Write a protein that binds this ligand. Structure first.
Ligand SMILES: C=CC(C)(C)OC[C@H]1O[C@H](O[C@@H]2C3=C([C@H](C)CN4CCCCC4)C[C@H](O)[C@]3(C)/C=C3/[C@@H](COC)CC[C@@]3(C)C[C@H]2O)[C@H](O)[C@@H](O)[C@@H]1O
Ligand SMILES: C=CC(C)(C)OC[C@H]1O[C@H](O[C@@H]2C3=C([C@H](C)CN4CCCCC4)C[C@H](O)[C@]3(C)/C=C3/[C@@H](COC)CC[C@@]3(C)C[C@H]2O)[C@H](O)[C@@H](O)[C@@H]1O
Ligand SMILES: [Mg+2]
Ligand SMILES: [Mg+2]
Ligand SMILES: [Mg+2]
Ligand SMILES: [Mg+2]
Ligand SMILES: [Mg+2]
Ligand SMILES: [Mg+2]
Lengths: 236, 5, 236, 5
């Protein structure tokens, strides 16, 4: 790997520089190199890993959506045939996106999840696993769509089970997991009632736990609670 | 689209 | 070249899709492939080429500035030594930026400029040549800084001479050339009086030509005139 | 920074 000759601490330092410069591809490459040193990640390092890949795939998803929209318009009644280029370029972006998802899932499977025993690491990585299968599901249309959806659900469910046993309701990782699993239900799994139920139960239980939330996690958790409320407002 | 984190 | 097997028209079509998806690296690669087909570019195609590379290098410049700022702070009195990583990563971004500039300059030199005879193409490409040497100048500190600055000036000057002879004062390419050459004077060449004089003369002459400006070019030209005024307000 | 186009 191209990062094999760089010190772990230098990779972490450069991932932080890349974040400041909004160079998310570089950030992800640095964090992949750090993971490949074979040591567990600290809490701050997990956050750098997640932010890097979330931003890379986020841009790919935005571009894929633009191109898929064009492609669907091109396949409507009365649209002029303009050849294979829209499909080809959508496929190009899609394959790149799938490659990034596969890279993240490979890091999680070797060997971040196996070695994560504390709830704050295990839930975090399982959430990421669900998220990256969800992004694969967004673009999947072949015979593997159902398996991809099942893999996302299984990861989210294991994370949910651990989070309810081991974390308080206002823990930001627990809240963010529930936010995203609720979106999975609504947008991926054709289960809007489950999505709404999860968002509402999560929000209500977090409210009753606010009297215990730390001032340090308050911004993160209240933001995620607001996102739960935003989704509920969109869905009801 | 709905919000995720 | 990786685009050698794709039809010219397909490259142009995909550059337009990439622009819509804000995939500027892809856009630039498609337009480089189109240029390498060996035919002159139309007016719309020139614009796609310019927008693609302007956005690629624009992001690199923004990241370089963030990292150079960190680097300079790290070299101040009382700053703790944190090793080679900031310099290394700034150098990495810088080398990538230089590579993109070199690629654009190579396309212009082979063979866009040689074959451009109409003013609207020749001035456009010479402006681009000045711009990409200017971006090289922004990061240059070695013995080549002066030569790079001279190359930018020579390109901008040839473009200026053609533009004043062959285009009306409110032509957007003429205006944009003058805007950028004025910035070159102020920020690169340590010639603020020349920068101010050029911006003022350009603005005043364009005002007196507005009664001839087409409704189609009105938005572009009035925007650039506003940018000239903005710079003059910053500089005086 | 000053504006360019
Ligand atoms: C920039 C520096 C680095 C080192 C990269 O840290 C980024 C952020 O990492 C922490 O935050 C975390 C995360 C986010 C929160 C919601 C952002 N937060 C919102 C309110 C204001 C302050 C910032 C989003 C990220 O995607 C980030 C890392 C991601 C997650 C999700 C990860 O699933 C795998 C689960 C929930 C959340 C939000 C945990 C949350 O704890 C700090 O606590 C923040 O201070 C800090 O900005
Ligand atoms: C998106 C579709 C594509 C095919 C890529 O076209 C982009 C734009 O190309 C034209 O515009 C041109 C350029 C810009 C003008 C200023 C933008 N304009 C501002 C007011 C509102 C409408 C948009 C910026 C570009 O960087 C663009 C292409 C660049 C330049 C400079 C290029 O030096 C080498 C010289 C001046 C200018 C501004 C010429 C200007 O003619 C159209 O006329 C616009 O409609 C259109 O959006
Ligand atoms: Mg070591
Ligand atoms: Mg595919
Ligand atoms: Mg339940
Ligand atoms: Mg052909
Ligand atoms: Mg250098
Ligand atoms: Mg003069």
């Amino acid at each position: 790997g191209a990062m094999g000759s760089m010190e772990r601490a230098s990779l972490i330092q450069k991932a932080k520089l890349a974040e400041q410069a909004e160079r998310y591809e570089d950030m992800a490459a640095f964090m992949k190199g750090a993971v490949e040193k074979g040591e567990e990640l600290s809490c701050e390092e997990r956050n750098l890993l997640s932010v890097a890949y979330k931003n890379v795939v986020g841009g790919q998803r935005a571009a894929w959506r633009v191109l898929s929209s064009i492609e669907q318009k091109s396949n409507e009644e009365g649209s002029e045939e303009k050849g294979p280029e829209v499909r080809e370029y959508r496929e190009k972006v899609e394959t790149e996106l799938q490659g990034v998802c596969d890279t993240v899932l490979g890091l999680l499977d070797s060997h971040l999840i196996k070695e994560a025993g504390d709830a704050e690491s295990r839930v975090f990585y399982l959430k990421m696993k669900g998220d990256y299968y969800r992004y694969l599901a967004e673009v999947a249309t072949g015979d593997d769509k159902k398996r991809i959806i099942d893999s996302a659900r299984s990861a989210y469910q294991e994370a949910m089970d651990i989070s309810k046993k081991e974390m308080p309701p206002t823990n930001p990782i627990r809240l963010g997991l529930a936010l995203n699993f609720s979106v999975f239900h609504y947008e991926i799994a054709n289960s809007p009632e489950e999505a709404i139920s999860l968002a509402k139960t999560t929000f209500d239980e977090a409210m009753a736990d606010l009297h215990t939330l730390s001032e340090d996690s308050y911004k993160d958790s209240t933001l995620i609670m607001q996102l739960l409320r935003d989704n509920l407002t969109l869905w009801t | 689209f709905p919000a995720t984190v």
